[PDB]
């Protein structure tokens with residue numbers, strides 16, 4: 089039940105709500121007030137998904153799907169079986185997410201470390217609430233949100249995108265993808281650097297941050313440094329998710345035509361709109 | 370066909386990999402213990418890995434993990450309930466006793482060394498050619514704690530030589546003695562440094578270093594430990 | 608309460624010329640400038656870089672790749688600066704039509720230039736790969752970087768060389784242009800039945816997303832424990848301190864299991880490497896073995 093060095097930290101304190109009432113663990117798990125909140129919302133949510141499954145008639149998880157109220161309902165409620173379940177499941181999801189974040193804050197306070205983790209998580213929560221709450225509200229219908237099923241939500245990704253031609257031309261989407269890819273590069277390098285120092289050539293002694301800096305300067309003329317790379321992964325990560333949210337918040341609301349056509353502004357600038365030759369004259 | 374052969378092999382390779390990765394992250398804290406320090410009954414489904422040995426750079430030795438485990442130190446805590454799963458109350462003063470968010474580990478009582486074998490961290494005064502290069506220089510600013518009372522003055526910055534960064538502020542007390550505050554737990558404002566983890570009376574309580582041009586890993590832990598703990602434990606005085 | 612995203616004080620000393628190990632020092636340049644800007648975030652020191660032969664081969668064919676694509680773009684612009692800038696994203700250097708199969712006999716102005724550019728790229732990438740191994744060897748370090756980079760090379764190899772070969776033609780490879788390569792990509796998906804049905808594609812995404820997940824976790828964790836020297840990961844690996852302890856414990860209390868300071872880097876190297884590993888099989892199998900991912904997916908084989 090405990091890691092060899094763990095007891096000294098399992099002290100009272102740090103709770104945000106409830107004082108010492110739920111200040112306890114279950115095996116490895118800390119139970120906030122917010123542990124209880126997440127269990128409550130996740131349990132409900134799961135039950136209503138199992139329910140929604142029988143009303144649709146499968147117990148197979150590759151097929152189970154929960155659609156939002158069809159466009160016809162706008163922002164109102166809708167009967168359980170025609171997307172009310174989705175509405176309650178969504179509210180449950182949000183409850184479970186924010187709860188999990190808030191539980192994290194309490195774990196942070198007990199450990200006396202910074203709030204960076206829940207703060208990062210908060211960007212993912214915010215991406216979710218863009219697909220399910222902010223976009224559908226700026227659009228006028230829960231129907232625009234995505235449904236809850238392994239394969240069916242991909243269907244939504246493809247339908248939503250192709251509504252704008254090749255979604256590649258969404259410029260905020262370009263930027264986000266750029267962050268996702270860079271993030272992965274950074275991750276591969278960070279892991280390979282640290283590990284290449286802790287596990288050097290063989291019988292050789294552990295290398296040092298000095299070596300890690302050296303290797304990167306030797307390689308590209310620059311090394312960001314051990315604090316830097318951690319600041320970086322964070323920033324690349326979160327920026328990817330920011331631009332994801334941003335690229336979808338603007339689609340269907342401030343831009344709704346073919347993303348390819350947005351680029352006409354640059355090509356049709358006065359100073360060059362008319363010169364002949366090239367691809368656009 | 371070839372593709373269903375590939376995808377199915379991959380799922381297997383990926384199970385192998387999770388296995389390797391999961392055991393690999395057991396080289397520390399394992400085996401699991403009950404609240405009383407005893408080997409727990411149920412260990413999980415992953416075995417410990419065969420040990421590995423890192424060779425440490427400066428005739429500094431070896432580490433072989435997994436190996437026999439222990440805090441090499443007392444733990445001023447006691448049980449507050451009658452079964453597994455609840456908190457353990459500090460038996461004395463948790464800051465002074467280094468438990469809870471004031472905890473520190475029995476890290477090695479020498480200093481981290483650079484790649485050249487020299488101390489990685491030095492007070493700026495002993496660091497040849499090193500000066501403050503951007504941002505407000507804190508040296509000379511009064512240090513104010515969360516009670517809004519002045520607890521001393523900044524007298525040097527301790528720097529990481531190979532990585533060229535601030536790591537501590539050395540702060541002087543009414544006493545005339547000094548203490549290290551971790552660079553990451555201070556606000557350098559224009560006319561003061563602000564330290565929210567501690568109130569003025571807890572500065573004396575900061576663990577002290579045995580020599581004024583070195584810190585040992587152990588001392589660093591007791592220092593960082595102490596000041597982080599203040600966020601929970603100073604908060605009455607705050 | 609301060610957050611360690613930007614430094615409050617920068618500190619500079621003598622420029623760090625770095626560890627001499629078995630490195631041939633004849634080949635390191637001298638230090639570059641120090642950037643105060645960069646130094647709010649990470650290291651302020653630029654340089655020194657090491658260049659020697661393989662380095663130069665690489666830097667040279669890199670440039671040659673780039674200038675090949677570059678003259679064609681200016682050509683496509685009919686030598687007019689205004690047009691060039693306007694239509695920058697629309698220019699495109701396409702490979703040979705399917706009629707030339709794999710032969711190098713295509714006219715310069717209709718795909719020969721593509722093969723030339725591709726040739727320069729091939730040697731730039733591989734020589735750089737070698738540089739990746741050799742800069743490690745000289746420092747006595749393990750070979751992880753080179754192995755990880757090899758994963759990236761795999762996808763890139765498959766896209767532009769291995770897959771066009773098994774397919775019988777270069778027309779199958781990816782053009783050089785900002786927009787045209789996005790088109791190639793959407794079009795590739797379409798022709799193969801929608802890559803959402805390609806289970807290697809789906810894995811690929813899980814890893815891509817998973818990388819953003821991990822690095823956000825990892826970065827955040829380290830910053831959170833950086834008030835106990837958490838970022839000095841190597842020395843936390845050789846002698847666990849409270850930073851490594853409280854980071855393990857946060858995860859363990861949150862999700863019920865956790866990593867070690869060294870183990871987390873293995874999670875990282877693999878999460879990222881798996882994106883392209885995965886992805887490369889995904890593409891490699893397309894058109895060579897599966898002609899339609901929807902279809903293949905219906906019989907699961």
Ligand code: BCL
Nearest residue numbers: 212213215216245246248249255256264265332333335336
């Ligand atoms: C044919 C389809 C279109 C297309 C249409 C779209 C559409 C439409 C969308 C994207 C979005 C994205 N696309 Mg695009 N996209 C295309 C081509 C690409 C290509 C490519 C190589 O060609 C790439 C790399 C990308 C990349 C991207 C990203 C920028 C983004 C997805 C990540 C994200 O938003 O995370 C955000 C992360 C989350 C929302 C996860 C949230 C997690 C929550 C908080 C917690 C869940 C916990 C869980 C329930 C608990 C599990 C229990 C455990 C088991 C215990 N697109 C093609 C052209 N793309 C999406 C986007 O930008 O979203 C804003 C989006 O909506």
Ligand code: BCL
Nearest residue numbers: 216219234238239241245808809810812813814816817820
């Ligand atoms: C982000 C932009 C798009 C999107 C586009 C895609 C695309 C495109 C793909 C996926 C894929 C996945 N997406 Mg999706 N997906 C979206 C939002 C979500 C949300 C959410 C709560 O917002 C969730 C939970 C998921 C979950 C999933 C998984 C079933 C799968 C692997 C993801 C992954 O590894 O991430 C990284 C995270 C980890 C590695 C952590 C582990 C996460 C685990 C696996 C989540 C389990 C979800 C569970 C099956 C459903 C919850 C039910 C519970 C009982 C409550 N997607 C939005 C709508 N998603 C891939 C797939 O393969 O689908 C078949 C794929 O190609």
Ligand code: BCL
Nearest residue numbers: 759760763792793795796802808811812815886887889890
């Ligand atoms: C509408 C378009 C299609 C689609 C078609 C494709 C195609 C086609 C491909 C992908 C690929 C991918 N797609 Mg898809 N994709 C779609 C929708 C999505 C969505 C979504 C809808 O939300 C997402 C999240 C993704 C995500 C992804 C990635 C997981 C994967 C690319 C991994 C990568 O790192 O590449 C980037 C990394 C590289 C290209 C490696 C390059 C490394 C080389 C060696 C370095 C070159 C640098 C060079 C020298 C220049 C350097 C200059 C510097 C400045 C010095 N796709 C839809 C269904 N997708 C790729 C894949 O693997 O699929 C299985 C791919 O080929």
Ligand SMILES: CC[C@H]1c2cc3[nH]c4c(c3C)C(=O)[C@H](C(=O)OC)c4c3nc(cc4[nH]c(cc(n2)[C@@H]1C)c(C(C)=O)c4C)[C@@H](C)[C@@H]3CCC(=O)OC/C=C(\C)CCC[C@@H](C)CCC[C@@H](C)CCCC(C)C
Nearest residue numbers: 130133180181184188208209212237238325329816819820
């Ligand atoms: C840049 C931010 C990146 C990020 C960061 C991030 N994620 C995080 C964190 C952070 C910092 C955590 O601290 C937290 C964690 O604990 O990690 C282990 C987490 C987390 N991110 C997770 C998933 C997740 N993150 C993703 C993405 C991202 N995470 C971003 C890329 C994705 C993607 C890419 O799709 C997924 C799938 C979980 C592992 C964990 C959050 C666990 C949690 O919140 O638990 C509470 C809830 C439950 C246990 C049960 C579900 C509740 C019910 C209401 C039912 C189902 C809801 C429904 C929407 C299902 C949808 C169906 C699908 C088929 C589509």
Ligand SMILES: [Fe+3]
Nearest residue numbers: 278282829840
């Ligand atoms: Fe790290």
